[PDB]
Design an enzyme around this catalytic site. Structure first.
Site, PDB file in Angstrom:
ATOM      1  N   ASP A   1       0.761  -1.250   0.000  1.00 53.21           N
ATOM      2  CA  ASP A   1       0.000   0.000   0.000  1.00 53.21           C
ATOM      3  C   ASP A   1       0.795   1.306   0.000  1.00 53.21           C
ATOM      4  O   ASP A   1       1.308   1.718   1.039  1.00 53.21           O
ATOM      5  CB  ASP A   1      -0.894  -0.045   1.237  1.00 53.21           C
ATOM      6  CG  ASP A   1      -1.991   0.966   1.212  1.00 53.21           C
ATOM      7  OD1 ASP A   1      -1.935   1.906   0.390  1.00 53.21           O
ATOM      8  OD2 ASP A   1      -2.905   0.822   2.049  1.00 53.21           O
ATOM      9  N   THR A   2       0.875   1.973  -1.153  1.00 50.82           N
ATOM     10  CA  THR A   2       1.603   3.247  -1.237  1.00 50.82           C
ATOM     11  C   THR A   2       0.903   4.394  -0.525  1.00 50.82           C
ATOM     12  O   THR A   2       1.496   5.450  -0.324  1.00 50.82           O
ATOM     13  CB  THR A   2       1.822   3.641  -2.693  1.00 50.82           C
ATOM     14  OG1 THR A   2       0.575   3.826  -3.357  1.00 50.82           O
ATOM     15  CG2 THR A   2       2.619   2.628  -3.494  1.00 50.82           C
ATOM     16  N   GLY A   3      -0.361   4.192  -0.158  1.00 47.41           N
ATOM     17  CA  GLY A   3      -1.102   5.245   0.510  1.00 47.41           C
ATOM     18  C   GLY A   3      -0.978   5.166   2.007  1.00 47.41           C
ATOM     19  O   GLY A   3      -1.428   6.050   2.724  1.00 47.41           O
TER      20      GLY A   3
HETATM   21  C1  LIG Z   1      -6.886   6.747   3.575  1.00 45.62           C
HETATM   22  C2  LIG Z   1      -5.373   6.697   3.295  1.00 45.62           C
HETATM   23  C3  LIG Z   1      -4.785   8.105   3.367  1.00 45.62           C
HETATM   24  C4  LIG Z   1      -4.597   5.801   4.267  1.00 45.62           C
HETATM   25  N1  LIG Z   1      -5.110   4.432   4.335  1.00 45.62           N
HETATM   26  C5  LIG Z   1      -4.472   3.592   3.339  1.00 45.62           C
HETATM   27  C6  LIG Z   1      -5.406   3.195   2.218  1.00 45.62           C
HETATM   28  O1  LIG Z   1      -4.627   2.579   1.173  1.00 45.62           O
HETATM   29  C7  LIG Z   1      -6.529   2.221   2.623  1.00 45.62           C
HETATM   30  C8  LIG Z   1      -6.068   0.753   2.901  1.00 45.62           C
HETATM   31  C9  LIG Z   1      -7.234  -0.171   3.295  1.00 45.62           C
HETATM   32  C10 LIG Z   1      -7.757  -1.090   2.389  1.00 45.62           C
HETATM   33  C11 LIG Z   1      -8.832  -1.935   2.765  1.00 45.62           C
HETATM   34  C12 LIG Z   1      -9.351  -1.784   4.062  1.00 45.62           C
HETATM   35  C13 LIG Z   1      -8.860  -0.871   4.997  1.00 45.62           C
HETATM   36  C14 LIG Z   1      -7.773  -0.043   4.611  1.00 45.62           C
HETATM   37  N2  LIG Z   1      -7.540   2.117   1.567  1.00 45.62           N
HETATM   38  C15 LIG Z   1      -8.808   2.656   1.679  1.00 45.62           C
HETATM   39  O2  LIG Z   1      -9.131   3.453   2.578  1.00 45.62           O
HETATM   40  O3  LIG Z   1      -9.570   2.154   0.661  1.00 45.62           O
HETATM   41  C16 LIG Z   1     -10.948   2.724   0.472  1.00 45.62           C
HETATM   42  C17 LIG Z   1     -10.785   4.050  -0.232  1.00 45.62           C
HETATM   43  C18 LIG Z   1     -11.161   3.796  -1.708  1.00 45.62           C
HETATM   44  O4  LIG Z   1     -11.353   2.365  -1.806  1.00 45.62           O
HETATM   45  C19 LIG Z   1     -11.719   1.822  -0.480  1.00 45.62           C
HETATM   46  S1  LIG Z   1      -5.295   3.843   5.897  1.00 45.62           S
HETATM   47  O5  LIG Z   1      -5.623   2.436   5.765  1.00 45.62           O
HETATM   48  O6  LIG Z   1      -6.279   4.692   6.545  1.00 45.62           O
HETATM   49  C20 LIG Z   1      -3.760   3.947   6.818  1.00 45.62           C
HETATM   50  C21 LIG Z   1      -3.405   5.115   7.563  1.00 45.62           C
HETATM   51  C22 LIG Z   1      -2.165   5.127   8.290  1.00 45.62           C
HETATM   52  C23 LIG Z   1      -1.321   3.946   8.221  1.00 45.62           C
HETATM   53  N3  LIG Z   1      -0.124   4.003   8.946  1.00 45.62           N
HETATM   54  C24 LIG Z   1      -1.669   2.830   7.492  1.00 45.62           C
HETATM   55  C25 LIG Z   1      -2.884   2.803   6.782  1.00 45.62           C
END
Ligand SMILES: CC(C)CN(C[C@@H](O)[C@H](Cc1ccccc1)NC(=O)O[C@H]1CCOC1)S(=O)(=O)c1ccc(N)cc1
EC number: 3.4.23.16
Lengths: 99, 99
Positions: B25-27
């Site tokens: 995960d790059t995000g």
């Molecule tokens: C929201 C972004 C800025 C950051 N997130 C990363 C994102 O890649 C996040 C990863 C994920 C995938 C599936 C379930 C739960 C989480 N995907 C996400 O929200 O998918 C939604 C938006 C569209 O499709 C569905 S995080 O998980 O909040 C996060 C925050 C801090 C740390 N240290 C690690 C992770």
């Protein structure tokens, strides 16, 4: 380009004729942007993240310019902490992860 | 390897002697792994994203093998719906986003 990840992979996007900053997010299935006015009708969609689910508005066939690359697809609008470019659009610009 | 994004970029990892599937995960700024037991002291931390915040335990200097690539760094343990490999470890394996 080839983007390393020592810093957040932020790019400039052009949507609705406005310039905004967005995160290139391989972990997001969909593209979600903060509240703004988009054209057309929308459909409801439930989106799951780290802290649970939220309700967003889905707009289809939206023209969006990502770091100079034009894409056309689905964009969700809702309360997101930052504009996110998800896999649906990343594939359109031919982005891949390499290691 | 070159990972296309038509599907979620899942890989097999090895942490604490256990095998798990995780999202490249790059995000994600940091790595977050589902509730498990890890050795060492830890600090409580709050992590937020879509849907709000979750409370996690921050473990330092943890070794993780990501798809055959050994790396070291901070790992957050908590009630995440999916195991996430964030930038803090992707950099260590030399992962890049290319388009
Ligand atoms: C929201 C972004 C800025 C950051 N997130 C990363 C994102 O890649 C996040 C990863 C994920 C995938 C599936 C379930 C739960 C989480 N995907 C996400 O929200 O998918 C939604 C938006 C569209 O499709 C569905 S995080 O998980 O909040 C996060 C925050 C801090 C740390 N240290 C690690 C992770």
């Amino acid at each position: 380009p080839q983007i390393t990840l020592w810093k957040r992979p932020l790019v400039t996007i052009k949507i609705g004729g406005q310039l905004k900053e967005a995160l290139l997010d391989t972990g997001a299935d969909d593209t979600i942007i903060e509240e703004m006015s988009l054209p057309g009708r929308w459909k409801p969609k439930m989106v799951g993240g780290i802290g649970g689910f939220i309700k967003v508005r889905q707009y289809d066939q939206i023209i969006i310019e990502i770091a100079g690359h034009k894409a056309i697809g689905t964009v969700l609008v809702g309360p997101t902490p930052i504009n996110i470019i998800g896999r649906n659009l990343l594939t359109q610009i031919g982005a891949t992860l390499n290691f």
